[PDB]
Design a protein around this motif. Sequence first.
Motif, PDB file in Angstrom:
ATOM      1  N   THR A   1       0.826  -1.203   0.000  1.00  0.00           N
ATOM      2  CA  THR A   1       0.000   0.000   0.000  1.00  0.00           C
ATOM      3  C   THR A   1       0.862   1.255   0.000  1.00  0.00           C
ATOM      4  OG1 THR A   1      -1.810  -1.137   1.136  1.00  0.00           O
ATOM      5  CG2 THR A   1      -1.762   1.269   1.256  1.00  0.00           C
ATOM      6  N   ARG A   2       1.962   1.241   0.753  1.00  0.00           N
ATOM      7  CA  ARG A   2       2.819   2.418   0.827  1.00  0.00           C
ATOM      8  C   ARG A   2       3.433   2.745  -0.529  1.00  0.00           C
ATOM      9  NH1 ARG A   2       4.947   3.539   6.549  1.00  0.00           N
ATOM     10  NH2 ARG A   2       3.553   2.278   7.852  1.00  0.00           N
ATOM     11  N   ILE A   3       3.877   1.728  -1.271  1.00  0.00           N
ATOM     12  CA  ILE A   3       4.391   1.975  -2.618  1.00  0.00           C
ATOM     13  C   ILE A   3       3.290   2.536  -3.509  1.00  0.00           C
ATOM     14  CG2 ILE A   3       5.307   0.886  -4.692  1.00  0.00           C
ATOM     15  CD1 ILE A   3       6.054  -0.704  -1.350  1.00  0.00           C
ATOM     16  N   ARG A   4       2.098   1.940  -3.450  1.00  0.00           N
ATOM     17  CA  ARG A   4       0.996   2.432  -4.270  1.00  0.00           C
ATOM     18  C   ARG A   4       0.628   3.859  -3.885  1.00  0.00           C
ATOM     19  NH1 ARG A   4      -2.588  -0.100  -2.395  1.00  0.00           N
ATOM     20  NH2 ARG A   4      -1.942  -2.204  -3.023  1.00  0.00           N
ATOM     21  N   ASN A   5       0.524   4.130  -2.583  1.00  0.00           N
ATOM     22  CA  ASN A   5       0.245   5.490  -2.137  1.00  0.00           C
ATOM     23  C   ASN A   5       1.411   6.420  -2.446  1.00  0.00           C
ATOM     24  OD1 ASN A   5      -2.089   4.361  -1.207  1.00  0.00           O
ATOM     25  ND2 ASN A   5      -1.648   4.646   0.974  1.00  0.00           N
ATOM     26  N   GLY A   6       2.641   5.950  -2.235  1.00  0.00           N
ATOM     27  CA  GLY A   6       3.796   6.776  -2.545  1.00  0.00           C
ATOM     28  C   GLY A   6       3.887   7.111  -4.020  1.00  0.00           C
ATOM     29  N   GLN A   7       3.606   6.133  -4.882  1.00  0.00           N
ATOM     30  CA  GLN A   7       3.627   6.390  -6.318  1.00  0.00           C
ATOM     31  C   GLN A   7       2.575   7.421  -6.701  1.00  0.00           C
ATOM     32  OE1 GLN A   7       6.068   6.012  -7.687  1.00  0.00           O
ATOM     33  NE2 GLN A   7       6.836   3.974  -8.197  1.00  0.00           N
TER      34      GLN A   7
END
Lengths: 129, 88, 218
Positions: A11-17
């Motif tokens: 989720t953090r990668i998706r949110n970060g992206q």
Amino acid sequence: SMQDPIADMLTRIRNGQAANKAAVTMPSSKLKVAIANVLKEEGFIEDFKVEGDTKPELELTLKYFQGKAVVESIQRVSRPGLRIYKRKDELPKVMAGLGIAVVSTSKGVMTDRAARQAGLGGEIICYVA
Amino acid sequence: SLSTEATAKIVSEFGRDANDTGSTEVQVALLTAQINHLQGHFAEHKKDHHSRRGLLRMVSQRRKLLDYLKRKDVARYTQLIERLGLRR
Amino acid sequence: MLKAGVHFGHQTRYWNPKMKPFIFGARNKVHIINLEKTVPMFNEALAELNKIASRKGKILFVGTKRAASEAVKDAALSCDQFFVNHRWLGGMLTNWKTVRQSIKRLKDLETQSQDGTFDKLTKKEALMRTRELEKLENSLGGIKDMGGLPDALFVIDADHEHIAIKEANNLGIPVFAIVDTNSDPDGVDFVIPGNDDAIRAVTLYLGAVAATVREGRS
RNA sequence: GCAUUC
RNA sequence: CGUAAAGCGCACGCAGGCGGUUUGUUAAGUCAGAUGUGAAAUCCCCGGGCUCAACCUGGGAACUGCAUCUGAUACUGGCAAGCUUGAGUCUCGUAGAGGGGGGUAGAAUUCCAGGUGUAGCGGUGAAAUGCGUAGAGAUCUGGAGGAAUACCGGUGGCGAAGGCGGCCCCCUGGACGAAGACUGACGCUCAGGUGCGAAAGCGUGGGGAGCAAACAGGAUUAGAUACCCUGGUAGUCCACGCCGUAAACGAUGUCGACUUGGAGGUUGUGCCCUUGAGGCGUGGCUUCCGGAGCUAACGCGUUAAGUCGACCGCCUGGGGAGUA
Ligand SMILES: [Mg+2]
Ligand SMILES: [Mg+2]
Ligand SMILES: [Mg+2]
Ligand SMILES: [Mg+2]
Ligand SMILES: [Mg+2]
Ligand SMILES: [Mg+2]
Ligand SMILES: [Mg+2]
Ligand SMILES: [Mg+2]
Ligand SMILES: [Mg+2]
Ligand SMILES: [Mg+2]
Ligand SMILES: [Mg+2]
Ligand SMILES: [Mg+2]
Ligand SMILES: [Mg+2]
Ligand SMILES: [Mg+2]
Ligand SMILES: [Mg+2]
Ligand SMILES: [Mg+2]
Ligand SMILES: [Mg+2]
Ligand SMILES: [Mg+2]
Ligand SMILES: [Mg+2]
Ligand SMILES: [Mg+2]
Ligand SMILES: [Mg+2]
Ligand SMILES: [Mg+2]
């Protein structure tokens, strides 16, 4: 409570992206490093680093191509509520091979292509586009 | 809730020393002391529902701690309940 | 170069989060622009404008605020480029062929005024129709001789002229804009962070771009 | 102030 | 599953589901290989034969399963030892209509007694019923009793929800902040179950000033079993028990992580401090407007209706019907 360190990681990668963040940080773990290690192999994340001994922290340096996130889509497949195990011939392919599915085989965490070549099945962790 | 003097006495009695306030026995002992004290409170304040909700929180917390203590090591759990005279 | 002025941004409560990279600090409750970062970007835009000028392109200046209405006209006179210094009519470029008729009217109205055929005893001819001249001159005067869509847009405020920016993006024309702290990026191809209302700042901008085009034009 | 219906 | 059908009124919690992090070990789940079995036919693939076809037929694959044996150890689970971030305990403070019991104060209404005093008062759109020469209304003095707490008072505060406003005492729950120490996954969610749960209502015993279903009269009207007016009982109040329903609404279940901002309120706290009804940080709760994104749209928007995860509840055209 926090019950999916892996799902929270993805989720953090998706949110970060989505937020165009240069990098994201989260608690570190051997499994998370295993996922982070494979992802760097194909060029989805520019690099990853671990800081701290008693309080290790995993930081992933996200990357962008032409101003848009490299990770087009990333979703958790196996969950504690419903886990997925695939055989050698049942290994899925994401976007007809353009994407890769992270598979936790007996020899370690590796991409579906690597698992298919090695001829082992295991847990399907997630799909990365 | 409970007076500081009484709280210190329980800590020094059930814990390894006077500054070990985290021991499960200390936590159970502190909760048991307050629960016993509140018996008189609700004997006459029969209709005081709002504070009774807090009491059940201590009851549930004590049961949760006791179950953990039993799981980790039954030996100390048996001793603790005997000294506190509970689980009847 | 990195001289005085320009750095003074708007108040902190009016800032736009998208330009967090281009701010340097909230001095006295007012954001101040990262000048050392501005210079490489400003020079890049100046170099790009020179390249566009080198290919005999047309760059149009867009300044609507009263603090820049007079300054932009001077830039359009120092060089041979076009400008808009009053209200930017919606559809100047998307339906330029529609306003094209309005330009033609100026040519006829200008012809009558200059040739003297309007000097008739009727005040409808002398005043009622002649007053339309500055109505369209102050509105389309700086765009009279474009003969088509421009090749690049220069904007003094990316937010006050947001209508101009939107039309340029739709037509794909390159956009150069002086973007102040409260303005909106991502609509301008080449963003020039800095102040938009300070007289010494606006004069430097339009004065600077007016020089590269002439040398680039050669 | 009251004042329905097609 | 905000408004179209659909989040229990809100909580506590057993069974169940799920679970942070490190090492060793087991090899149950899982994965790999082999063996046995998975009848024939049928389906399936390459062939053969009936003039072709249907049809018949050879071999293979398939029968996704099950059992055993041999191995792998990443992940899940079991077991052992750990760790501190989840969660919890302790020390010191802060705010608050949080709850239960008791007491008390002031203003006002009604009633009772008395003085002064005279023909109206009261009410409506208008009017009448009604009250009054048996002295009303008005005005003054004393007394009785019940209920609610003006101003403060504020999209302010507290509580799980319902809900909670004079002042004081007694008992008592929760929340939050500051650093420091302690326990070491003790957690999350929850069918059934259990507790709480506005108002109205019911039972027994009190109390009853005001207000007021029902009821009565006077009006309005074609009629008026209403709206308006004059009266007025249950009820509203107290003690105990029952009822368990609300548009019990944020029409939005609980817990955790992540994701641009702006302006306020409220309650802690650190720091610069002489140039204070100052300057810069850091927590909790809360109101408004808005970005990406999301949505059928309206709109929501770090307090998500955005991006995810765990668990539970619930919906499947309208009416019949939340009825038999
Ligand atoms: Mg009729
Ligand atoms: Mg409806
Ligand atoms: Mg509905
Ligand atoms: Mg609800
Ligand atoms: Mg685990
Ligand atoms: Mg096995
Ligand atoms: Mg067969
Ligand atoms: Mg044949
Ligand atoms: Mg055959
Ligand atoms: Mg293990
Ligand atoms: Mg239930
Ligand atoms: Mg009631
Ligand atoms: Mg009653
Ligand atoms: Mg009674
Ligand atoms: Mg009435
Ligand atoms: Mg209901
Ligand atoms: Mg309510
Ligand atoms: Mg409400
Ligand atoms: Mg509801
Ligand atoms: Mg719960
Ligand atoms: Mg909004
Ligand atoms: Mg029924």
